[PDB]
């Protein structure tokens, strides 16, 4: 198991940022990469053992520490917007160095300002009667709209339990204002069930959207609610 | 390491064999050929390694010609879940490992073979109030192209495949909506 300290991060330009990679397999080798569109997976820094470090292909702007064998820290002394990325760490045993086990990934978004951070609004659209009649299936659609940055995870819950069968969520969000640099985002998902299952008023359908936003240490001065990390949902009961 | 060259992207259908060729003409004596597989929203994972002879495991086969200047990853009867980036890496291994150069690899897409295409466009109303609606284009064959919106106030998603696994049923769809009421689902994907 390879752990990363955070799944999502929102940080301001100029702030000092830490990402931790942790493994308890006593692996000698640890690695930090970032992953960007069109540029693939690029090596930042690695470490062959405790207190050892060596620059990777793109070390500029980064530093690392390896005080303990289990932990490889990635350090951004002064975050910049170009460091917005997906960060992936890995580890490997010295005698099996080419077999790298990767962590789950950390999305870091660096912003000049927190003014434009927004949580999603969420809405569930009920299945078409025409679909029900024609196919005996029923597709619910969820829209998560108006969020910024692109930090959401959408899930479907039926009668309080998460479902995966019959679901498809867009891999990529759409920009609501494609010409604007800090455009808010939208994301859609579908849940398809049998028509008779939708037709039961005892069945509860929820589209649940986890947003990774601000924390208690971030300041907020606007009248609108502070866009903290939060879960926003919309729901429908079945209908006859 | 030796430099590797592979296609940027590849398309396929569920159920077929997929073959990805990697070129590495400066490979040296002590180099091995390694492939990694990276699923969406995950880091890469090791899947196969070879030297000169054919290797087969649960995930793939690796074919290596006699001159070792290229190699081919063969993925069996691919599933939708095999949509992933595949990386070809050539270099020294084990205790002599130095570093990988992942590059961008090959983006493999896997399409479903829709058994009974039944294309239709539906309109769905908001559960909260039928003030808002969305359009759903669904059940079309996998060669159907869904175009992005040329209009800034209209939103059209890429196609998405859902799997109703208990019914052995898969379907394509795309969603479209607009911040205007006059928006007609009839022409939305047209």
From TrEMBL, chain A:
Disulfide bonds join 142-207. Residues 120-229 form the Ig-like domain. Zn(2+) 2 binds at residues 151, 153. It comes from the Eukaryota. Zn(2+) 1 binds at residue 134. It is found in: Cell membrane. This is Human nkt tcr beta chain. It comes from Homo sapiens (Human).
């Amino acid at each position: 198991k390879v752990t990363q300290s955070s799944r999502y991060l929102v940080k301001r330009t100029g702030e000092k940022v830490f990402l931790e990679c942790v493994q308890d397999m006593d692996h000698e080798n640890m690695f930090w990469y970032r992953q960007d569109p069109g540029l693939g997976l690029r090596l930042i820094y690695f470490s062959y053992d405790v207190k050892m470090k060596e620059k990777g292909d793109i070390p500029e702007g980064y530093s690392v520490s390896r005080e303990k064998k289990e932990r490889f820290s990635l350090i951004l002394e002064s975050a910049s917007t170009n460091q917005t990325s997906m960060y992936l760490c890995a580890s490997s045993q010295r005698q099996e160095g080419d077999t790298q086990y990767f962590g789950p990934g950390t999305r870091l978004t660096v912003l000049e300002d927190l003014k434009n951070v927004f949580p999603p609004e969420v809405a569930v659209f009920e299945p078409s009667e025409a679909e029900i009649s024609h196919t005996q299936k029923a597709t619910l659609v969820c829209l998560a709209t108006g969020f910024y940055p692109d930090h959401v995870e959408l899930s479907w819950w039926v009668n309080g339990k998460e479902v995966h069968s019959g679901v498809c969520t867009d891999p990529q969000p759409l920009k609501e204002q494609p010409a604007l640099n800090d455009s808010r985002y939208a994301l859609s998902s579908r849940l398809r069930v049998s028509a008779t299952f939708w037709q039961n008023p005892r069945n509860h359908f929820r589209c649940q959207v986890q947003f990774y936003g601000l924390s208690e240490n971030d300041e907020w001065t606007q009248d609108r609610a502070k866009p903290v990390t939060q879960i926003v949902s919309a729901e429908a009961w079945g209908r006859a | 390491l030796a430099k590797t060259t592979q296609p940027i992207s590849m398309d396929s259908y569920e159920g077929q064999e997929v073959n990805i060729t990697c070129s590495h003409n400066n490979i040296a004596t002590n180099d091995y050929i390694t492939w990694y597989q990276q699923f969406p929203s995950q880091g890469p994972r090791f899947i196969i390694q070879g030297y000169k002879t054919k290797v087969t495991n649960e995930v793939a086969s690796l074919f290596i010609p006699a001159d070792r200047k290229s190699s081919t990853l063969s993925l069996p009867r691919v599933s939708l879940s095999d949509t992933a980036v595949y990386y070809c890496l050539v270099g020294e291994i084990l205790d002599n490992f130095n570093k990988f150069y992942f590059g961008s690899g090959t983006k493999l897409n896997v399409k479903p073979n829709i058994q009974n295409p039944d294309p239709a466009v539906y309109q769905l109303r908001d559960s909260k109030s039928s003030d808002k609606s969305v359009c759903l284009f669904t059940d079309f064959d996998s060669q159907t192209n869904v175009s992005q919106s040329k209009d800034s106030d209209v939103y059209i998603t890429d196609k998405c495949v859902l799997d109703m696994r208990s019914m052995d049923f898969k379907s394509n769809s795309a969603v479209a909506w607009s911040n205007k009421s006059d928006f007609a689902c009839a022409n939305a994907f047209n």
